[PDB]
Amino acid sequence: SIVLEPIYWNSSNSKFLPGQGLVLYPQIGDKLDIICPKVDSKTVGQYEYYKVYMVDKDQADRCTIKKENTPLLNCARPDQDVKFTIKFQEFSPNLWGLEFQKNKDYYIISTSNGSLEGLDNQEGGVCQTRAMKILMKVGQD
Numbered sequence: 257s258i259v260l261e262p263i264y265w266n267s268s269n270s271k272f273l274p275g276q277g278l279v280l281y282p283q284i285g286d287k288l289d290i291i292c293p294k295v296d297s298k299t300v301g302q303y304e305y306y307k308v309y310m311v312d313k314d315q316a317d318r319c320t321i322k323k324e325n326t327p328l329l330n331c332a333r334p335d336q337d338v339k340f341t342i343k344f345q346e347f348s349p350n351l352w353g354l355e356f357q358k359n360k361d362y363y364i365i366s367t368s369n370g371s372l373e374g375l376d377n378q379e380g381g382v383c384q385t386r387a388m389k390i391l392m393k394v395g396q397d
């Protein structure tokens with residue numbers, strides 16, 4: 257029904273409010289792209305690395321990820337195009353697809369710290385220091 261504005265997942269994006277992060281209200285059927293940091297020749301900045309995960313409320317609050325969690329976005333090519341389209345669909349086409357329900361809250365965070373060495377860190381990171389997290393209040397407002 258509508259393509260929401262894309263979310264650029266990087267430390268210079270102001271949509272992430274201090275402390276609170278980003279809060280959205282997507283509706284079933286909408287789509288949203290999460291775009292990995294990309295540096296080329298007209299985009300100034302240092303390589304930024306992140307693993308982005310869908311997690312539960314508790315994990316978001318504590319900025320932690322369990323080793324059973326699998327990234328929905330693995331930003332490991334700071335020099336290329338890497339993005340993930342979240343489709344707020346009720347039914348997934350496969351085992352790895354996402355499914356959403358109306359009037360349900362979903363969270364996305366990264367406990368990576370932006371550096372190559374902290375890509376796999378499972379606690380803190382930008383979730384904790386820069387509020388780089390997203391709350392999606394599906395089917396609401």
Ligand SMILES: *[C@@H]1O[C@H](CO)[C@@H](O[C@@H]2O[C@H](CO)[C@@H](O[C@H]3O[C@H](CO)[C@@H](O)[C@H](O)[C@@H]3O)[C@H](O)[C@H]2NC(C)=O)[C@H](O)[C@H]1NC(C)=O
Nearest residue numbers: 264265266267268269270271292293294295299300301302
């Ligand atoms: C970090 O996130 C920034 C967004 O908060 C992002 O800025 C946005 O970058 C995109 C990609 O370059 C720009 O895209 C637009 O401009 C290009 C060039 O003309 C067009 O081809 C596209 O179609 C599109 O219109 C956005 O304009 C820009 N938005 C803002 C607010 O500046 C940074 O690029 C990200 N930085 C890194 C290092 O990934």
